Amino acid sequence: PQITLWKRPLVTIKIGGQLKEALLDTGADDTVLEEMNLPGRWKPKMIGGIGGFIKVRQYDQILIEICGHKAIGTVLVGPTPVNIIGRNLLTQIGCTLNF
Amino acid sequence: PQITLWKRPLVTIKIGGQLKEALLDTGADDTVLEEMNLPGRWKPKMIGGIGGFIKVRQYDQILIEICGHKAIGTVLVGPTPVNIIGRNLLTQIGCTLNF
Ligand SMILES: COc1ccc(S(=O)(=O)N(CC(C)C)C[C@@H](O)[C@H](Cc2ccccc2)NC(=O)O[C@H]2CO[C@H]3OCC[C@H]32)cc1
């Protein structure tokens, strides 16, 4: 599909058995999801943007389905105000910017 | 052009007659640029990111050319970690997401 940018590019994702709304974010190197209790091992990480840094938990090789497109990669979990699909997963679903 | 996302979507912009590098950021509602001198009037505003809120100077109806495409709109100037081009300008140059 083609998504215009009049409104936030929110799409439905499936992760850890749950459906959520997430932002297709070309400005995000990594995928950052709102706080959730995923199983498995993780490593602490700090990511920074406008306003400063937040502490997140890095999970690797997590399966995510984005608009019926399957993907698997690193997912960060922490106190983000929004679910953010970053470039590490956008590349896997064949997402491009066009103008 | 069609821009893949295996690298940061960085492009050259022109604003106030000066060239800069900026990030095409579909996850940003607004355009926020690093500290710079801009002619014209401005008003103080606050914007929130993943790490909290920052003070910025809002410039309205500013001419800005993005990868050869012209836009005229609001530009926020403040302590952002990166020059980001947000949806308010991405729409003006006809930018869409596609997968
Ligand atoms: C390492 O992996 C990372 C992944 C994501 C980020 S980030 O979130 O700080 N950022 C980065 C951008 C500011 C360069 C992505 C931007 O698209 C980021 C995503 C976001 C965070 C909080 C609330 C809404 C939207 N958007 C953002 O900061 O936009 C600003 C400017 O316009 C406003 O709309 C959204 C919030 C305001 C940082 C690191």
Coordinates of C-alpha atoms and ligand atoms in Angstrom, one line a residue:
Chain A
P1 CA 0.0 0.0 0.0
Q2 CA 0.8 3.7 -0.2
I3 CA 0.5 5.8 3.0
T4 CA 0.2 9.6 2.8
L5 CA 1.5 11.8 5.6
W6 CA -1.4 14.1 6.3
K7 CA -1.9 12.2 9.6
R8 CA 0.5 10.0 11.7
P9 CA 1.4 6.8 9.7
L10 CA -0.1 4.5 12.3
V11 CA -0.6 0.8 11.4
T12 CA -1.5 -2.3 13.3
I13 CA 1.3 -4.6 14.4
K14 CA 1.3 -8.0 16.1
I15 CA 4.0 -8.7 18.7
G16 CA 4.2 -11.2 21.5
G17 CA 0.7 -12.3 20.9
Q18 CA -0.8 -8.8 21.1
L19 CA -2.2 -6.4 18.5
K20 CA -1.0 -2.7 18.8
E21 CA -0.9 0.5 16.9
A22 CA 2.6 1.7 15.9
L23 CA 4.2 4.5 13.9
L24 CA 6.1 3.7 10.7
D25 CA 9.0 5.9 11.6
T26 CA 11.8 6.6 9.0
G27 CA 13.5 8.8 11.6
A28 CA 14.0 5.9 14.1
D29 CA 17.1 3.7 13.8
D30 CA 15.5 1.1 16.0
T31 CA 12.0 -0.2 17.0
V32 CA 10.8 1.0 20.3
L33 CA 7.6 -0.3 21.9
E34 CA 5.6 0.9 24.9
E35 CA 6.1 -1.0 28.1
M36 CA 5.1 -4.6 27.9
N37 CA 6.2 -7.8 29.7
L38 CA 7.9 -9.9 27.0
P39 CA 9.6 -13.1 28.0
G40 CA 13.2 -14.0 27.4
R41 CA 16.6 -12.5 28.1
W42 CA 17.4 -8.8 27.3
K43 CA 20.1 -6.2 27.6
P44 CA 19.8 -2.7 29.0
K45 CA 20.1 0.2 26.5
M46 CA 19.8 3.9 26.3
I47 CA 18.3 5.7 23.3
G48 CA 18.1 9.5 22.9
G49 CA 16.0 11.9 21.0
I50 CA 14.2 15.2 21.6
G51 CA 14.1 15.8 25.3
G52 CA 16.9 13.4 26.2
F53 CA 17.3 9.7 26.8
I54 CA 15.1 6.9 28.1
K55 CA 16.2 3.5 29.4
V56 CA 14.9 0.6 27.5
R57 CA 15.2 -3.2 27.4
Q58 CA 16.6 -4.7 24.2
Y59 CA 15.1 -8.0 23.0
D60 CA 16.6 -9.7 19.9
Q61 CA 15.1 -11.9 17.2
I62 CA 11.5 -10.9 18.1
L63 CA 8.8 -11.7 15.5
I64 CA 6.7 -8.7 14.5
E65 CA 3.9 -8.6 11.9
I66 CA 3.4 -5.2 10.3
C67 CA 0.3 -4.9 8.1
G68 CA 0.5 -8.6 7.4
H69 CA 4.2 -8.3 6.6
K70 CA 6.3 -10.5 8.8
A71 CA 9.5 -9.3 10.3
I72 CA 12.0 -10.4 12.9
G73 CA 14.7 -8.3 14.6
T74 CA 15.7 -6.3 17.6
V75 CA 12.9 -4.6 19.6
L76 CA 13.5 -2.1 22.4
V77 CA 10.9 -1.9 25.3
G78 CA 10.6 1.0 27.6
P79 CA 8.6 4.1 28.6
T80 CA 8.1 5.5 25.2
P81 CA 4.9 7.5 24.6
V82 CA 4.3 5.7 21.3
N83 CA 5.0 2.4 19.6
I84 CA 7.7 3.2 17.0
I85 CA 8.6 0.9 14.0
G86 CA 12.1 1.8 13.1
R87 CA 14.3 1.2 10.0
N88 CA 15.6 -2.1 11.3
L89 CA 12.1 -3.5 10.6
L90 CA 10.9 -1.1 7.9
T91 CA 13.6 -2.5 5.6
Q92 CA 12.4 -6.0 6.2
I93 CA 8.8 -5.2 5.0
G94 CA 10.1 -3.4 1.9
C95 CA 9.1 0.1 3.0
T96 CA 10.5 3.1 1.0
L97 CA 10.1 6.8 1.0
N98 CA 8.9 8.3 -2.3
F99 CA 8.6 11.8 -3.6
Chain B
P1 CA 13.3 9.5 -5.9
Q2 CA 12.6 6.1 -4.1
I3 CA 14.6 6.0 -0.9
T4 CA 15.4 2.7 0.8
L5 CA 15.9 2.7 4.6
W6 CA 19.0 0.6 5.1
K7 CA 20.7 3.9 5.9
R8 CA 19.3 7.0 7.6
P9 CA 17.3 9.0 5.1
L10 CA 19.5 12.1 5.2
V11 CA 19.1 14.8 2.6
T12 CA 20.5 18.2 1.9
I13 CA 18.2 21.1 2.7
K14 CA 18.4 24.9 2.0
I15 CA 17.0 27.3 4.6
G16 CA 17.7 30.9 5.2
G17 CA 20.1 30.7 2.2
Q18 CA 22.3 28.1 4.0
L19 CA 22.7 24.4 3.2
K20 CA 22.3 21.8 5.9
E21 CA 21.8 18.0 6.3
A22 CA 18.4 16.9 7.7
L23 CA 16.6 13.6 8.4
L24 CA 13.3 12.7 6.6
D25 CA 11.3 11.7 9.7
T26 CA 7.9 10.3 9.2
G27 CA 7.6 9.9 13.0
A28 CA 7.8 13.7 13.5
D29 CA 4.7 15.8 13.3
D30 CA 6.9 18.9 13.0
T31 CA 10.2 20.0 11.6
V32 CA 12.8 20.8 14.2
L33 CA 16.3 22.1 13.4
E34 CA 19.4 22.6 15.4
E35 CA 20.2 26.0 16.8
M36 CA 20.7 28.5 14.0
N37 CA 20.1 32.1 13.1
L38 CA 16.9 32.7 11.1
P39 CA 15.5 36.0 9.9
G40 CA 12.0 37.1 10.8
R41 CA 9.7 36.9 13.9
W42 CA 9.3 33.9 16.1
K43 CA 7.4 32.8 19.2
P44 CA 8.6 30.5 22.0
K45 CA 6.9 27.0 22.0
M46 CA 7.4 23.6 23.7
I47 CA 7.7 20.3 21.9
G48 CA 7.9 16.8 23.3
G49 CA 9.9 13.9 22.1
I50 CA 10.8 10.4 23.3
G51 CA 12.9 11.8 26.2
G52 CA 10.8 14.8 27.3
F53 CA 10.1 18.3 26.3
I54 CA 12.3 21.1 25.0
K55 CA 12.0 24.9 24.4
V56 CA 12.0 25.8 20.8
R57 CA 11.6 29.0 18.7
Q58 CA 8.8 28.6 16.2
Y59 CA 9.2 30.3 12.8
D60 CA 6.1 30.4 10.6
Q61 CA 5.9 30.4 6.8
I62 CA 9.6 29.8 6.3
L63 CA 10.9 28.9 2.8
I64 CA 12.9 25.6 2.8
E65 CA 14.0 23.5 -0.1
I66 CA 14.3 19.7 0.6
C67 CA 16.2 17.6 -1.8
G68 CA 15.3 20.0 -4.6
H69 CA 11.6 20.4 -3.7
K70 CA 10.3 23.6 -2.3
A71 CA 8.2 24.0 0.9
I72 CA 6.9 26.9 2.9
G73 CA 5.8 26.2 6.5
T74 CA 6.6 26.1 10.2
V75 CA 10.1 25.4 11.4
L76 CA 11.0 24.8 15.0
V77 CA 14.6 25.7 16.1
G78 CA 16.0 24.3 19.4
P79 CA 18.2 21.8 21.0
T80 CA 17.2 18.8 18.9
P81 CA 19.9 16.1 18.5
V82 CA 19.4 16.0 14.7
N83 CA 17.8 18.2 12.0
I84 CA 14.5 16.5 11.3
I85 CA 12.1 17.1 8.5
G86 CA 8.6 16.4 9.8
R87 CA 5.2 15.6 8.2
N88 CA 4.3 19.3 8.0
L89 CA 6.9 19.6 5.2
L90 CA 7.0 16.0 3.9
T91 CA 3.4 16.5 2.8
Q92 CA 4.4 19.6 0.9
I93 CA 7.0 17.8 -1.2
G94 CA 4.7 15.0 -1.9
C95 CA 6.4 12.4 0.3
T96 CA 4.6 9.0 0.9
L97 CA 5.5 5.7 2.5
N98 CA 5.2 2.6 0.3
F99 CA 5.5 -1.1 0.8
Ligands
LIG1 C1 18.1 4.2 18.3 O1 16.8 4.0 18.0 C2 16.0 5.1 18.1 C3 14.5 5.1 17.7 C4 13.6 6.3 17.9 C5 14.2 7.6 18.4 S1 13.2 9.0 18.6 O2 11.8 8.6 18.9 O3 13.7 9.9 19.6 N1 13.2 9.8 17.1 C6 14.5 10.1 16.6 C7 14.6 11.5 15.9 C8 14.3 12.6 16.8 C9 15.9 11.7 15.3 C10 12.2 9.3 16.2 C11 11.2 10.5 15.8 O4 10.5 10.1 14.6 C12 10.3 10.7 17.0 C13 9.4 9.6 17.2 C14 8.4 10.0 18.3 C15 8.9 10.0 19.8 C16 7.9 10.5 20.9 C17 6.5 10.9 20.5 C18 6.0 10.9 19.1 C19 7.0 10.5 18.0 N2 9.5 11.9 16.7 C20 9.7 13.2 17.2 O5 10.5 13.3 18.1 O6 9.0 14.2 16.6 C21 8.9 15.5 17.3 C22 8.9 16.4 16.5 O7 7.5 16.5 16.0 C23 6.6 16.0 17.1 O8 5.7 14.8 16.6 C24 6.1 13.7 17.2 C25 6.8 14.2 18.4 C26 7.4 15.6 18.0 C27 15.7 7.6 18.8 C28 16.5 6.4 18.6

